[PDB]
């Protein structure tokens, strides 16, 4: 019985590790940040379109 | 007096041998019954674990 419990635990942990890059909050959070930085930059570029065109 | 003590010894010894023989038969039947039930327990436990 004890072996069976630990075996299940192991199986569960293995499944979680294999799918962490797309599922875990930590990794997903990093991707969000990178995307927000670029958004802001593009907003700025669009706001100064006239000046940039003139240049 | 020696004849009386010998008669007592004979009675006790007879009782003893008779009891021991019948007790061994019960112990064997009992252990067999316990093992059979224990085996049923083990099969149920394995099935429950797999379902979980």
Closest residue in B to A4 (Cα–Cα): B49
Q: Is B45 in Cβ contact with A1 (below 8 Å)? A: yes
Q: Is A8 in Cβ contact with B52 (below 8 Å)? A: yes
**Is B41 part of the contact surface with chain A (CB cutoff 8 Å)?**
no
This structure was determined by: cryo-EM
CB burial string B19-31: b at 16+ within 10 A, e below: eeeeeeeeeeeee
Contact B45, A2 (CB under 8 A): no
Q: Give the count of alpha carbons within 13 A of B8, CB side only.
A: 5
| Ramachandran sector of residue B50 (left: φ over 0; alpha: ψ -120 to 50; beta: rest) | alpha
Contacts of B47 in chain A (CB under 8 A): none
CB burial string A15-43: b at 16+ within 10 A, e below: eeeeeeeeeeeeeeeeeeeeeeeeeeeee
**Is B49 part of the contact surface with chain A (CB cutoff 8 Å)?**
yes
- Residue B36, CA distances (Å) to A10, B22, B30, B41 in order: 33, 22, 10, 9
């Amino acid at each position: 019985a004890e072996i069976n419990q630990k075996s299940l635990e192991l199986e569960l942990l293995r499944l979680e590790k294999e799918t962490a890059d797309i599922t875990h909050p930590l990794y997903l959070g990093q991707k969000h940040q990178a995307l927000q930085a670029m958004n802001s930059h593009l907003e700025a570029v669009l706001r100064e379109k006239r000046s940039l065109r003139q240049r | 007096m020696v004849e009386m003590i010998e008669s007592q010894t004979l009675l006790l010894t007879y009782l003893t041998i008779k009891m021991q023989k019948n007790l061994f038969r019960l112990e064997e039947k009992a252990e067999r019954n316990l093992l059979l039930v224990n085996d049923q327990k083990d099969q149920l436990q394995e099935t429950i674990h797999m379902m979980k």
